[PDB]
Design a protein around this ligand. Sequence first.
Ligand SMILES: [Cl-]
Ligand SMILES: [Cl-]
Ligand SMILES: [Cl-]
Ligand SMILES: [Cl-]
Ligand code: NA
Ligand SMILES: [O]
Ligand SMILES: [O]
Ligand SMILES: [O]
Ligand SMILES: [V+3]
Ligand SMILES: [V+3]
Ligand SMILES: [V+3]
Length: 129
Amino acid sequence: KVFGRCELAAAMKRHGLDNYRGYSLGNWVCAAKFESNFNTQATNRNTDGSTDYGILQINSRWWCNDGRTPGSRNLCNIPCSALLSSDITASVNCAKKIVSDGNGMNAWVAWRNRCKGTDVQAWIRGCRL
Ligand SMILES: [Cl-]
Ligand SMILES: [Cl-]
Ligand SMILES: [Cl-]
Ligand SMILES: [Cl-]
Ligand code: NA
Ligand SMILES: [O]
Ligand SMILES: [O]
Ligand SMILES: [O]
Ligand SMILES: [V+3]
Ligand SMILES: [V+3]
Ligand SMILES: [V+3]
């Protein structure tokens, strides 16, 4: 599913991401925009052999099981395929564990490089949430 900007903001807020670990909703929408262009089916192979999955490009190196990433963990206890669902619950629940892991949203390199420090409220501006 390719979410609209406001549609994803509303869903992320309903799922508890708004101010989760202090990160305002715009941070999460911005990260999703640059990680997946709001496409739940986005997948990208990393140079290390891991794969990023879903709207928040969660990596099989640590967070999910895809059966093809040697030496990896599955800290969210889920099939990476669950991160591609039109329903963002699995991606949100796993993102909550990732963002609580110590480096906050810096875990998302696109967030650090393209959202961090910017006017992220612009991502939820005008939205009926
Ligand atoms: Cl915001
Ligand atoms: Cl990535
Ligand atoms: Cl694996
Ligand atoms: Cl933080
Ligand atoms: Na894994
Ligand atoms: O919502
Ligand atoms: O990644
Ligand atoms: O959901
Ligand atoms: V990657
Ligand atoms: V649901
Ligand atoms: V709502």
